[PDB]
Amino acid sequence: ENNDLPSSFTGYFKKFNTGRKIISQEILNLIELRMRKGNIQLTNSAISDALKEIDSSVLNVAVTGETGSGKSSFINTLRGIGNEEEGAAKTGVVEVTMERHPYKHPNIPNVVFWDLPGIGSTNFPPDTYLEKMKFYEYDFFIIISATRFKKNDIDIAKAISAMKKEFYFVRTKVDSDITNEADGEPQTFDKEKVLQDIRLNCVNTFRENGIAEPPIFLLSNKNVCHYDFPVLMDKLISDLPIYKRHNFMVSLPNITDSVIEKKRQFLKQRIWLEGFAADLVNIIPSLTFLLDSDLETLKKSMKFYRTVFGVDETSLQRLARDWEIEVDQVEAMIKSPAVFKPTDEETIQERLSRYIQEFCLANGYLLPKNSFLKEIFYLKYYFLDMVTEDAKTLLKEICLRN
Numbered sequence: 111e112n113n114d115l116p117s118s119f120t121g122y123f124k125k126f127n128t129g130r131k132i133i134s135q136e137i138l139n140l141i142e143l144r145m146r147k148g149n150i151q152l153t154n155s156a157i158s159d160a161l162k163e164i165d166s167s168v169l170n171v172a173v174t175g176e177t178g179s180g181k182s183s184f185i186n187t188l189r190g191i192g193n194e195e196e197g198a199a200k201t202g203v204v205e206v207t208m209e210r211h212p213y214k215h216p217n218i219p220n221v222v223f224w225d226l227p228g229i230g231s232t233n234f235p236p237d238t239y240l241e242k243m244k245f246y247e248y249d250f251f252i253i254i255s256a257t258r259f260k261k262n263d264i265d266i267a268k269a270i271s272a273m274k275k276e277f278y279f280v281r282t283k284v285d286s287d288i289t290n291e292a293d294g295e296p297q298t299f300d301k302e303k304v305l306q307d308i309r310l311n312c313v314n315t316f317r318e319n320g321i322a323e324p325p326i327f328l329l330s331n332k333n334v335c336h337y338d339f340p341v342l343m344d345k346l347i348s349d350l351p352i353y354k355r356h357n358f359m360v361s362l363p364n365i366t367d368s369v370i371e372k373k374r375q376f377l378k379q380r381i382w383l384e385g386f387a388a389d390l391v392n393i394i395p396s397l398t399f400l401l402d403s404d405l406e407t408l409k410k411s412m413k414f415y416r417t418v419f420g421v422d423e424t425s426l427q428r429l430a431r432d433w434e435i436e437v438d439q440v441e442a443m444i445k446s447p448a449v450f451k452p453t454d455e456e457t458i459q460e461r462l463s464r465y466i467q468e469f470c471l472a473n474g475y476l477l478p479k480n481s482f483l484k485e486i487f488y489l490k491y492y493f494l495d496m497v498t499e500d501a502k503t504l505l506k507e508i509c510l511r512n
């Protein structure tokens with residue numbers, strides 16, 4: 111195929127949708143220009159900066175609404191926390207306080223959810239409210255409502271729109287409405303129709319009050335991944351500057367296979383980046399000896415991936431708790447927990463040695479003839495596929511246990 115490095119390096123990213131790239135074209139060109147000239151110190155530095163930006167990226171998400179709107183369950187769902195685990199948002203807690211309480215993401219501390227007090231329980235008018243709540247500090251400004259449209263909510267929307275700014279409308283408890291129509295309306299019932307009506311009623315409420323009509327999302331916290339949740343996350347990511355997508359993408363709850371699959375694609379681009387900033391070699395990866403200086407990097411990488419896909423230690427026992435079984439049985443459903451557990455069958459070195467042969471037999475080296483990433487990186491790809499698979503497996507169990 112292509113025996114050119116600069117060319118092969120950037121040729122890799124065309125394997126992802128324009129919106130699922132984690133680095134801009136411009137930045138990608140910078141890296142190539144340097145690489146083209148052969149200036150190794152500068153191309154490593156360029157990549158390094160690019161990853162520095164991605165990581166240091168901070169994300170502030172503001173969520174507002176009246177009590178019982180679903181505001182807590184929402185924020186907790188976006189953090190992978192139960193509605194009662196230590197560090198969860200509680201109802202009316204912020205309302206009484208009358209002050210915004212932040213909630214850093216457990217694994218991605220750079221992602222912050224700001225639970226804002228319902229304007230109803232504050233002696234602040236719309237504009238003063240936003241002012242006190244520091245509106246221009248959030249990347250996202252969500253307004254959450256349930257079945258009844260609150261007059262307060264309307265005024266806030268009216269203030270933001272009149273301000274020429276944007277916000278998202280997350281309507282919850284849609285499940286309640288579908289169960290009510292099904293009950294009283296035997297045949298004249300249809301979730302698809304009920305859904306449509308609820309949506310057009312939100313649309314008009316905004317139009318009627320002279321609001322520009324924002325992105326609307328109907329959903330249920332008593333059964334996420336079922337309605338506009340997947341769409342909600344796609345929209346949120348799409349509205350982000352490229353460099354901020356990575357951190358928010360990997361933070362997202364693993365509610366569907368697509369979310370999970372989208373996470374893997376992002377990380378497959380990070381490995382490639384790390385692989386090159388680390389500099390290529392001419393020795394076949396399966397013929398290398400793994401140093402402890404490497405086994406660590408790989409143990410650290412595995413802990414991160416596992417956490418990102420919710421198949422780590424905590425997440426596991428948490429699931430054992432629900433299903434009333436034990437972690438063991440759970441770890442027996444997936445593969446990643448075993449990787450670093452010494453068994454009578456083989457030692458770490460022996461196992462990782464095999465993973466590299468299998469990976470390259472199935473995927474070949476990803477570069478031009480006699481060019482290779484350092485072994486340590488092919489293993490990350492391997493770990494990444496294993497974790498992705500595991501998350502998917504467990505997600506099936508979660509649903510298979512209704």
Ligand SMILES: Nc1nc2c(ncn2[C@@H]2O[C@H](COP(=O)(O)OP(=O)(O)NP(=O)(O)O)[C@@H](O)[C@H]2O)c(=O)[nH]1
Pocket residue numbers: 175176177178179180181182183184200201202203204205228282283284285286329330331332
């Ligand atoms: N059926 C159903 N219930 C929901 C949904 N979202 C939240 N709830 C329910 O509402 C209760 C509490 O909602 P919760 O999110 O705590 O309220 P809150 O909006 O956060 N209060 P606060 O606004 O003060 O933060 C729980 O009983 C949960 O069943 C939903 O989409 N469908």
Ligand SMILES: [Mg+2]
Pocket residue numbers: 181182199200201202204225
């Ligand atoms: Mg709350």
